[model samples]
Target: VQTTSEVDLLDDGYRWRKYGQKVVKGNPYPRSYYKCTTPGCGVRKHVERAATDPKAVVTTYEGKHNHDLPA
Candidate 1:
């Protein structure tokens, strides 16, 4: 009953970098934090295991960003 969800932090068109992770008391898995990779971007994303299933995961995004796609 494990599943993974791919979350695009570039919703607002911003970029991010995986920063750190912390282990919680009850959760076997740790929570990960991502910061914007761009020089001036301040976007971030948080990822953690889904409470319903250890195999499943949940992701949360914060802030808005502007992006440019390659042609």
Candidate 2:
């Protein structure tokens, strides 16, 4: 979902570790890749800034959580 947030990286309960980051085609902002910190979990998420709106951050998540939610 598209969110009009200020920070590019916003915590959403789950714990994540930054794995990689790369510049995506047609976008000036570099996209960041993250993975679940929990062992055996395969959840991943991508975070990037909107080219047209720098103040907005776009985040897309994949996979299912295999553990309890973070506080």
The lDDT of each candidate is 0.69, 0.80
Candidate 2 Cα RMSD after full superposition onto the native fold (Å): 9.5
lDDT of 2 at 16: 83
Q: After superposition, how far is residue 68 of candidate 2 from its true place, in Å?
A: 1.9
Candidate 2, residues 1-71: lDDT per residue as tens digits?
Answer: 77876645466778788888998687876888897778788888887788877568888888889887766
Assess every candidate by TM-score. 0.57, 0.61
Model 1: per-residue lDDT, tens digit, 1-71? Answer: 65787655454444557678888887867787887777656778787887658587787778766555423
lDDT of 2 at 2: 71
Give per-residue lDDT, candidate 1, residue 16. Answer: 57
Clashes of each: 1, 0
Superposed by TM-score, candidate 1 places the C-alpha of residue 10 at a distance from the truth, in angstroms, of 16
* Model 2: ten consecutive residues of lowest lDDT: 4-13
